[PDB]
Write a protein that binds this DNA or RNA. Structure first.
Ligand SMILES: [Mg+2]
Lengths: 462, 59, 456, 52
DNA sequence: TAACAGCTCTAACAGGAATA
RNA sequence: AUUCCUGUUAGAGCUGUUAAC
């Protein structure tokens, strides 16, 4: 039972729902004062519940004698607060059990006394008539005894459920934001505090879908190399060293590398090098999100792995990488699909040629490939584009750029993107998780498995 | 938001139409919204219909 | 893994017209039903005056005279409806200015045109219009015309001619609709005629259209900034705007400065809490002092940790603050499949992550097109082949993508200065940007708040 | 603000509806600065008595 | 405070007109 | 500047990671 169903069901009958256990204490204090959820049980001190109630209302709270809980419950003199401290409340809990459905939060079980307490409360003919709801922050993290008890109750015929919600205070805030007819003083007192770290749930996948350009990256971790230096280095010095040497490996400072050891010995002499070790970045998404150096390193690694064995050329423009089609290899059969996509009115379409009104500028089709760290996911971002051979003369073809793409509408752009995905990965987006690897013949290589199908979602409907 | 406000009614109806639900006062809507809210739970549906049409608001 | 959260297509918002007859397409609703303020007869007759060099008075008079005759669109005919003239479409007569109201640009302006002094040219134009200071009651809208010969002073580093002119005239409380040579060439006459007619009617004081079923208890704040290239460093001019709806049928769209010196576009605790106190006061005065049950803030850049607390400390507990950052440049872009012959539907918002969504403010709209009925219309098919989805980053809202997404989508439709179907940004953002330019050009505006009809 | 001089002509014509419409239409100048003025003191000269 | 990486935006120009 | 925002050319501001002073 999803939390939305629990909220619709809990909100409808909050008058007779028991609770077993700072917005959460505050919302509960307001919820009690409001005469809803009359009886609340707890294990711990948390003497803050009664203090919050006194702040809300201005009167003391009954906190639990021989059978004081029994006397208060039987006489219907709500609201009642009783701490288990784990048979004095055991009879009262069983008496409470028939009267209204119970919801237990902040408890993982693990205590046999309360376990037998609840199991004994279940047996009677009408026990927890509204339902027993277990709300843990995560379903899979809960102790096995809780699931065993839920299954036992469901077998007995009771309507016990195990629902996954957030933290108890967040759950109570979400409950209270939809409780109706609350006095002004209570709302002024609680106001659900303030929500700084906004986190609104993503809906279900659901089922006119839209196809995005994002390719998922499921490689959760990669292995790479570290070099130790006897002297401090700056990133600019490393960058100019790579520019002047041009090794067959990818370098960054965080000093981190990926490629062959002899290239490292070429770029760095023995005197400055102390030792070479390995780095295991366990969480790639979090790492590239926290550090921009890792972001650039990983995007360049994926780029190198992507055009390693393919005839397409790799260029760079304002620090964004492009998969530009070379003129020499523009006649390959693999580009034929692209030849169809660029084509006008179902004919062959030129993908590399001479701009009609410039002396030496030569144009080609290309795709900008970027890395996007969204949430905790890595996406390969494909954007079709027209590349111009002189990097600094691109604007001279601006009109031509406007002329060619003027009619690359949704169908044409869809064809272009599908053809470019086929060119870059060799397979269509059906059951595709192809693997690429950069520098396969090196000690420190990186293999990345990229989902071939572009990210997409279907509109939710009935 | 009070449901009999025009602005809130329009906003809620626009939201409902966003998820592809029936448009406006059309057949198979009342039952549709009941079966959507209560996801085939006839006991909870009965309890809500009792509460809405209860014998305390009737004059 | 290629599965994303289910997108939801926000329907095209409706616009309110005369007799509260709703319609999604603004100009078509204006033709069928007329301006929203026609029932109130707020503008009444529209009386306008001229201020231009005498040598081009015939061209200015010809465009105004044309305003009173029907025009049929030739460009963007898939969207634009046949123009019927000011008298018919707006249910309001267009008044021929008398010689007393008609003014001539003083001669020395032409001379300073050679000097390339923008400030001198703007001041000379203001002094030319000074003959209209006393006769403010006679006319409603002034039509300043700047000839192409003045283009040397139109735009240059550190100066904007229209911006300076409007910044000088706004304190004067005179409404100008500057007309350049551009008006009279955009081959399609109906396009320009719709633009000028709507601008003049709204400039006059009327409301061409209003958001249908708009909540009067929600105020949509929007903050933007502008660059002044100082000799030593940079200057960031930040200004806010409000588009709330008062107790009456009035639209109430305003713009104001957030203020002594700023090198970064992020408002501190003091400045942000001060401006949020200031925009709240404008909402209360229009709404009879009632507090706003929900506040939307659209910033072009991310909110700082101190800035969020500043926004919070300015309001009571009842107010709901949904801080939103709007991002125009994103790597994402969408393709619609069923491959649809037309691009992805406008308003389709995709929740990417917790507090990050993709809104397709740009896109195809159903039932708006005039030619070939029953087909989608893509407004920006001329510029871009496919729409560019903007990205919302939530910072404070407790929950709900629908509220912010629908609010922004509806807000991108009430720009009277715009003569097309919608915009890329909510009117709050675009007007905050325009007033940011105005303030950056003219520092002596920071004291007072101004309505949208002045700078639109 | 200043009332239109057409209000005087309408008052001389003895047309109450058009006079009220003209008085309301004179309010547009204050309409822009609706934020500017909290209250409005509308004065009517005795010469308009024929339409009071 | 001086580099470096990324994200993002505005500043100035230029520029054609909505499925061909 | 009736409008729309697509490109180009640049720079700034935010974050980070290093080197320090
Ligand atoms: Mg304008």
């Amino acid at each position: 039972l999803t939390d939305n169903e629990f909220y619709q069901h809990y909100l409808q009958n909050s008058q007779h729902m028991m609770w077993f256990l700072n917005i959460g204490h505050r919302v509960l204090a307001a919820l009690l004062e409001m005469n809803q959820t009359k009886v609340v049980f707890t294990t711990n001190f948390d003497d803050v519940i009664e203090t919050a109630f006194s702040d809300i209302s201005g009167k003391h709270l009954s906190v639990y004698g021989s059978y004081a809980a029994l006397s208060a419950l039987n006489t219907e003199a709500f609201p009642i607060y009783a701490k288990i401290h784990g048979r004095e409340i055991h009879k009262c809990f069983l008496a409470a059990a028939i009267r209204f459905g119970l919801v237990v939060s902040g408890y993982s079980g693990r205590d046999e006394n309360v376990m037998t307490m609840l199991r004994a409360a279940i047996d009677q003919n009408n026990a927890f008539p509204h339902g027993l709801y277990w709300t843990v922050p995560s379903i899979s993290k809960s102790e096995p005894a809780v699931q065993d008890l839920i299954t036992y109750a469901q077998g007995k015929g009771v309507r016990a459920y195990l629902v996954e919600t957030g933290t108890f205070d967040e759950m109570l805030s979400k409950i209270w934001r939809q409780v109706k007819d609350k006095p002004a003083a209570i709302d002024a007192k609680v106001r659900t505090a303030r929500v700084c770290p906004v986190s609104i749930p993503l809906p279900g996948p659901g089922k006119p879908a839209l196809r995005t350009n994002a390719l998922p990256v499921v490689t959760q971790s990669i292995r790479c190399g570290v070099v130790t230096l006897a002297s401090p280095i700056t990133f600019s010095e490393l960058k100019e060293r790579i520019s002047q040497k041009s090794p067959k490996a990818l370098l960054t400072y965080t000093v981190l590398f990926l490629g062959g050891e002899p290239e490292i010995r070429k770029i760095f002499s023995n005197d400055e090098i102390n030792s070479i070790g390995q780095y295991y970045i366990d969480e790639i998404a979090q790492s590239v999100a926290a550090s921009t150096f890792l972001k650039s390193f990983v995007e360049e690694a994926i780029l190198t792995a992507l055009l390693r064995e393919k005839p397409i050329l790799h260029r760079v423009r304002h620090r964004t990488h492009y998969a530009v089609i070379p003129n020499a290899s523009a006649k390959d059969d693999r580009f034929l699909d692209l030849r169809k996509a660029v084509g006008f009115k179902g004919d062959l379409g030129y993908i590399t040629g001479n701009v009609t009104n410039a002396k030496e500028l030569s144009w080609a089709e290309a795709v900008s490939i970027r890395l996007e760290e969204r949430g905790g996911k890595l996406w390969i971002m494909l954007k079709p584009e027209i590349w111009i051979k002189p990097l600094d003369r691109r604007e001279e073809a601006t009109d031509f750029i406007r002329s060619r793409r003027r009619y690359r509408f949704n169908q044409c752009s869809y064809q272009i993107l599908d053809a470019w995905i086929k060119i870059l990965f060799g397979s269509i987006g059906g059951g595709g998780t192809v693997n690429i690897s950069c520098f396969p013949d090196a000690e420190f290589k990186a293999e990345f498995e990229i989902g071939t199908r572009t990210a997409f979602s279907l509109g939710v409907g009935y | 938001h009070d449901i009999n406000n025009h602005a809130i009614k329009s906003k809620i109806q626009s939201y409902m139409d966003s998820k592809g639900f029936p448009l406006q006062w059309s057949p198979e809507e009342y039952s549709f919204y009941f079966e959507l809210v209560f996801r085939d739970d006839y006991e909870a549906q009965r309890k809500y219909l009792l509460e809405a049409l209860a014998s305390r608001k009737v004059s | 893994l290629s599965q994303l959260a289910a997108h939801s297509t926000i329907p095209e918002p409706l616009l309110l017209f005369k007799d509260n007859r709703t319609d999604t397409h603004p100009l078509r609703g204006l033709s069928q039903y007329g301006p929203y303020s026609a029932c109130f007869n707020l503008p009444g007759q529209v009386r306008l005056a001229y201020l231009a060099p005498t040598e081009h008075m015939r061209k200015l008079d010809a465009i105004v005279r044309e305003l009173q005759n029907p025009a049929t669109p030739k460009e963007a005919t898939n969207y634009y409806v046949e123009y019927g003239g000011f008298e018919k479409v707006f249910k309001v007569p267009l008044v021929m200015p008398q010689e007393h109201l008609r003014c001539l640009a003083l001669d020395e302006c032409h001379g300073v045109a050679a000097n390339g002094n923008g400030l001198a040219l703007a001041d000379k134009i203001v002094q030319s219009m000074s003959g209209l200071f006393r006769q403010k009651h006679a006319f409603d809208v002034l039509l300043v015309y700047l000839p192409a010969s003045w283009k040397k002073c139109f735009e240059y580093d550190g100066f904007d001619l229209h911006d300076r002119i409007k910044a000088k005239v706004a304190p004067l409380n005179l409404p100008i609709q500057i007309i350049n040579d551009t008006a009279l060439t955009r081959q399609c006459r109906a396009n320009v005629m719709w633009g000028v007619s709507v601008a003049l009617y709204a400039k006059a004081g009327g409301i061409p259209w209003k958001l249908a079923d708009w909540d009067k208890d929600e105020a949509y704040i929007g903050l933007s900034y502008a660059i002044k290239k100082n000799a030593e460093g940079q200057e960031y001019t930040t200004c806010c705007s409000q588009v709330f709806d008062p107790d009456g049928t009035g639209f109430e769209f305003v713009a104001y400065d957030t203020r002594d010196r700023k090198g970064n576009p992020y408002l501190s605790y003091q400045e942000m809490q001060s401006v949020l106190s200031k925009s709240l006061h404008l909402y209360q005065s229009s709404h009879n002092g009632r507090m706003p049950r929900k506040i939307f803030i659209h910033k072009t850049t991310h909110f700082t940790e101190d800035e969020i607390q500043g926004a919070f400390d300015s309001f009571s507990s009842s107010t709901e603050i949904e801080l939103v950052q709007i991002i125009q440049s994103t790597n994402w872009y969408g393709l619609k499949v069923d491959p649809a012959s037309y691009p992805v539907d406008r308003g389709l918002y995709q929740p990417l992550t917790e507090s990050e969504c993709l809104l397709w403010t740009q896109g195809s709209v159903m039932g708006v097109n005039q030619q070939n009925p029953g087909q989608p219309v893509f407004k920006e098919a001329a510029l871009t082949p496919l729409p560019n989805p903007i990205m919302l980053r939530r910072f404070s809202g407790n929950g709900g993508w629908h509220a912010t997404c629908s609010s922004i989508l509806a807000l991108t439709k009430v720009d009277w200065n715009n003569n097309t179907l919608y915009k890329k940004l909510p009117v709050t953002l675009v007007y905050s940007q325009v007033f940011a330019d105005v303030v950056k050009q003219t520092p002596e505006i920071v004291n007072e708040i101004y309505d949208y009809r002045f700078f639109m």
